[PDB]
Ligand binder design. Structure first.
Ligand SMILES: *[C@@H]1O[C@H](CO)[C@@H](O[C@@H]2O[C@H](CO)[C@@H](O)[C@H](O)[C@H]2NC(C)=O)[C@H](O)[C@H]1NC(C)=O
Ligand SMILES: *[C@@H]1O[C@H](CO)[C@@H](O[C@@H]2O[C@H](CO)[C@@H](O)[C@H](O)[C@H]2NC(C)=O)[C@H](O)[C@H]1NC(C)=O
Ligand SMILES: *[C@@H]1O[C@H](CO)[C@@H](O)[C@H](O)[C@H]1NC(C)=O
Ligand SMILES: *[C@@H]1O[C@H](CO)[C@@H](O)[C@H](O)[C@H]1NC(C)=O
Ligand SMILES: *[C@@H]1O[C@H](CO)[C@@H](O)[C@H](O)[C@H]1NC(C)=O
Lengths: 86, 228, 328
């Protein structure tokens, strides 16, 4: 009844790029491993057993800079770093 | 000198560790060879296509059908074998534009980071650029960008000016910092506290227009040499 | 400056044939023509995400703004995100979003619109980065360059007052620090008068965002040209395959339903060719915009006419549909 021969399903999820079948959505957030679309990325993490999970991608670390009108931040040391560029 | 040399040696020795690991560091050089192999594989894999004709073999058609009825299947194969080659040349000329745009950027980065020092941020690596070393690579070049990364910062109290005798003193190449009780002057990228001296600051105006001006003593390096 | 492009996927069988015909058995004699085009389209679809990751993901730490918004008399209320909004955008970003009339076909929802090209096998993939995430990358980039200056682009975020930050930035063009410390209110009033004129010059004149409309409308024009070339004959008797199959005699159909197949293959190759050509312009614009961000927002450049007309002090980026707007 379908041009697709087989049919699979474990868990369904409503993503804005389409219906994601086979991944469980979690409330956590990590770095984007496999891009799905619209702020949703998939990876392979454990929680024991390993399974494909769905999550929203991490924007980064949250760091509120302690800004004021009478404070300065002067470094006391340094680090010599070499960065490759292909 | 020895700390900077040891940090540079420890950062250079980690480059070979970061390059021999993770198995996908040189992806920008592998993708060009992968594309140039995929195009050459697709150009041969379309020779086994008939494009709606009887067979994909030419010697079958020239020895199978009529001396003037085979010239409509051969002309059907020719108008697909000249189209696949035209598409290959068009895609190669498209990829050559990206290769030239990458090579011009590589030459600009070589001339502006290897042959000198650039003030463009994030052009010769992340951080304050110091040096860059080129490396010979297959179908490309690798730049080892030596940068300056500050660390271990401390919190101080700042001020725009220092009022000594009803005059406003501004720092020449430094900044007024305070460790809680005294006021010092240091450079912007490294903590090196020095005393407030008339050779480190310059005088411009009074203490009535500057907002946030504080009170301290500006040490004259002449007056102890006049009393003695 | 434009940054990204509408990602389009093409169903080759549903475009050449009509998904209800025995044309699909005749398309297998060509083999690898429907795979190379979708491979080149997947390359563009990941390239327009790489172009956004190269521009907006320049920092890996989301910086925040202090609750007390005093910066020496300067007013950033029109460029900071408004918390009394569901999109959490700025006062310039909600006007920039409302002036770019998008016509993409990437949705799930079902008199018909211009997105009836999905029924011919031409779909639109959504981008990886949501516009709310781009507006928060913009917020982190503003909160870094306001509370730290250029220290957040080279190393750790070092705090600095904004009066001393602009006094530092006056030294980069050859002006001493005493000019701002004697005329701080005049500089603050001139900045707050020049910021408020940006929304007046953007809501008026009706043609400010022409570079984004020229890349929004061009994809829709290339799609509508691809659909309007389906109602052609290429030297045959009809355009509908269900008439040639249900009317003519089987062995004389391998020319009339070969001309249409070759024409629809040439149209798809032409569409992929002009999209691969015009994607190199969007990639060059993104490579220019990332360099402009790194040299004008993350730092102070001494290059003439690279961060505006005049002596550059600082820049403020704003999130735009399929692009970015720089406030130099
Ligand atoms: C701020 O710095 C001054 C000088 O850099 C410190 O004063 C010195 O304090 C040590 C021990 O407290 C004494 O041995 C020195 O003789 C002091 N020098 C002078 C010139 O007074 C001061 O203690 C520092 N304050 C803080 C809170 O760190
Ligand atoms: C910064 O500028 C904005 C406008 O650009 C100021 O907001 C105005 O505030 C007055 C209050 O007297 C209102 O009557 C206006 O309607 C506001 N304008 C808008 C567009 O909302 C704001 O007060 C300024 N200062 C700060 C600290 O944000
Ligand atoms: C300086 O900052 C403090 C707290 O950060 C604030 O209370 C004070 O009002 C600020 N000064 C001015 C002139 O606004
Ligand atoms: C600094 O000293 C002058 C003169 O002694 C005085 O008028 C002024 O108020 C002082 N400033 C502060 C902040 O105490
Ligand atoms: C999918 O269908 C359900 C019910 O038919 C509807 O409520 C929902 O809005 C649909 N999804 C989208 C993204 O519109």
């Amino acid at each position: 009844p379908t041009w697709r021969v087989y049919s699979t399903g474990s868990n369904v999820f409503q993503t804005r790029a389409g219906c994601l079948i086979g991944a469980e959505y979690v409330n956590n957030s990590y770095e984007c491993d496999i891009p799905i679309g619209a702020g949703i990325c998939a990876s392979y993490q454990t929680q024991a057993s390993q399974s494909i999970i769905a999550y929203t991608m991490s924007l980064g670390a949250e760091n509120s800079v302690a800004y004021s009108n009478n404070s300065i931040a002067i470094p006391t040391n340094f680090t010599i770093s070499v960065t490759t560029e292909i | 000198q020895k700390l900077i040399a040891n940090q540079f040696n420890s950062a250079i020795g980690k480059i070979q560790d970061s390059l021999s690991s993770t198995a996908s560091a040189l992806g920008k050089l592998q993708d060009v060879v992968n594309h140039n192999a995929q195009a050459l594989n697709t150009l041969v894999k379309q020779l086994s296509s008939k494009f709606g004709a009887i067979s994909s073999v030419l010697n079958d058609i020239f020895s199978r059908l009529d001396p003037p009825e085979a010239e409509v299947q051969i002309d059907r194969l020719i108008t697909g074998r000249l189209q696949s080659l035209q598409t290959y040349v068009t895609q190669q000329l498209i990829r050559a534009a990206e290769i030239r745009a990458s090579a011009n950027l590589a030459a600009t980065k070589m001339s502006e980071c290897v042959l000198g020092q650039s003030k463009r941020v994030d052009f010769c690596g992340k951080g304050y650029h110091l040096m860059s070393f080129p490396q010979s690579a297959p179908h490309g070049v690798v730049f080892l960008h030596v940068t300056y990364v500050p660390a271990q910062e401390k919190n101080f109290t700042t001020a725009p000016a220092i009022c000594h005798d009803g005059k406003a003193h501004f720092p020449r190449e430094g900044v007024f910092v305070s460790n809680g009780t005294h006021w010092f002057v240091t450079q912007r990228n490294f903590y090196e506290p020095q005393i407030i001296t008339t050779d480190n600051t310059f005088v411009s105006g009074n203490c009535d227009v500057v907002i946030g001006i504080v009170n301290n003593t500006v040490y004259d390096p002449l007056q102890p040499e006049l009393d003695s | 400056l434009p940054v990204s492009m509408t990602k389009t996927s093409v169903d080759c069988t549903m475009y050449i044939c009509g998904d209800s015909t025995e044309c699909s058995n005749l398309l297998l004699q060509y083999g690898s023509f429907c795979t190379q085009l979708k491979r080149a389209l997947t390359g563009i679809a990941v390239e327009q995400d790489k172009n956004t990751q190269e521009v907006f993901a320049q920092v890996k730490q989301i910086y925040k703004t202090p609750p007390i918004k005093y910066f020496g008399g300067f007013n950033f209320s029109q460029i900071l995100p408004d918390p009394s909004k569901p999109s959490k955008r700025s006062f310039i970003e909600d006007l920039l979003f409302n002036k770019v009339t998008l016509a993409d076909a990437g949705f799930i929802k079902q008199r018909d619109l211009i997105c009836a090209q999905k029924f011919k096998g031409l779909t639109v993939l959504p981008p990886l980065l949501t516009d709310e995430m781009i507006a928060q990358y913009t917020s982190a980039l503003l909160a870094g360059t306001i509370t730290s200056g250029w220290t957040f682009g080279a190393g750790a975020a070092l705090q600095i007052p904004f009066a001393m930050q602009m006094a530092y930035r006056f030294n980069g063009i050859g002006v001493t620090q005493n000019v701002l410390y004697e005329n701080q209110k005049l500089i603050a009033n001139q900045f707050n008068s020049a910021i408020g004129k940006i929304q007046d010059s953007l809501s008026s004149t009706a043609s400010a965002l022409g570079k984004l409309q020229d890349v929004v409308n061009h994809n829709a024009q290339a799609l509508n040209t691809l659909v309007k070339q389906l109602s052609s004959k290429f030297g045959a008797i009809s355009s509908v395959l269900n008439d040639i199959f249900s009317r003519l005699d089987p062995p004389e159909a391998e020319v009339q339903i070969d001309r249409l197949i070759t024409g629809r293959l040439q149209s798809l190759q032409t569409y992929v060719t002009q999209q691969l050509i015009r994607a190199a312009e969007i990639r060059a614009s993104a490579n220019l915009a990332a360099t402009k961000m790194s040299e004008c927002v993350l730092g102070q450049s001494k290059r003439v006419d690279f961060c505006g007309k005049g002596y550059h002090l600082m820049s403020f980026p704003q999130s735009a549909p399929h692009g970015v707007v720089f406030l130099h």
